[PDB]
Amino acid sequence: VNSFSGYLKLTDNVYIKNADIVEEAKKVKPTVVVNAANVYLKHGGGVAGALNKATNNAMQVESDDYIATNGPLKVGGSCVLSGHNLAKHCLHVVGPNVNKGEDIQLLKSAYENFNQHEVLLAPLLSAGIFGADPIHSLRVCVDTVRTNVYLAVFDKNLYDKLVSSFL
Numbered sequence: 425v426n427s428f429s430g431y432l433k434l435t436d437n438v439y440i441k442n443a444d445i446v447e448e449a450k451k452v453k454p455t456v457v458v459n460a461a462n463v464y465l466k467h468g469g470g471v472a473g474a475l476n477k478a479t480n481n482a483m484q485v486e487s488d489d490y491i492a493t494n495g496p497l498k499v500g501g502s503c504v505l506s507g508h509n510l511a512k513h514c515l516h517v518v519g520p521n522v523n524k525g526e527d528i529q530l531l532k533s534a535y536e537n538f539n540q541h542e543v544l545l546a547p548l549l550s551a552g553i554f555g556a557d558p559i560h561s562l563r564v565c566v567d568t569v570r571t572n573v574y575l576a577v578f579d580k581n582l583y584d585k586l587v588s589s590f591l
């Protein structure tokens with residue numbers, strides 16, 4: 425039993441809710457919140473920009489030190505950093521950004537990072553400003569993640585379409 429509330433159950437382990445992931449994380453304080461990161465951990469917009477703003481830019485400061493030490497992530501890769509005031513940990517995961525021409529096949533690799541964590545709060549990877557089809561992203565999530573994932577979908581119109589089209 426965990427403290428996530430109001431989610432629809434898609435599968436044994438995948439759960440979905442119309443919610444602002446920032447407000448969800450502040451309420452639940454999960455062990456792991458997933459960020460829709462880029463390889464540079466530049467958290468300018470989308471989910472990443474919103475999560476960073478909620479940390480008063482502390483996420484960006486930590487991220488800049490990480491990059492200065494380790495260099496950029498791989499597309500499809502991840503790193504674990506602090507969750508600041510939002511969660512114990514933030515798993516920064518880089519899904520392909522279609523608006524940069526990045527291979528959508530790397531989306532499965534991106535979701536595989538979730539399997540290293542027993543429970544996660546997460547957005548749909550490569551959705552929103554990353555330019556992929558969120559219906560496809562949900563399918564890859566369900567077919568790749570085996571651990572317990574609680575998906576927050578900010579857009580109510582998108583949330584309703586994802587449920588009604590889910591096979």
Ligand SMILES: O[C@@]1(CNc2ncnc3[nH]ccc23)CCC[C@@H](C(F)(F)F)C1
Binds near residue numbers: 444446547552579
């Ligand atoms: O959930 C989506 C990712 N973005 C977010 N998800 C959850 N909390 C959030 N807070 C701020 C941003 C955000 C999935 C792709 C479409 C995207 C869009 F807004 F464009 F419709 C919504």
Ligand SMILES: [Cl-]
Binds near residue numbers: 470551553
């Ligand atoms: Cl977005």
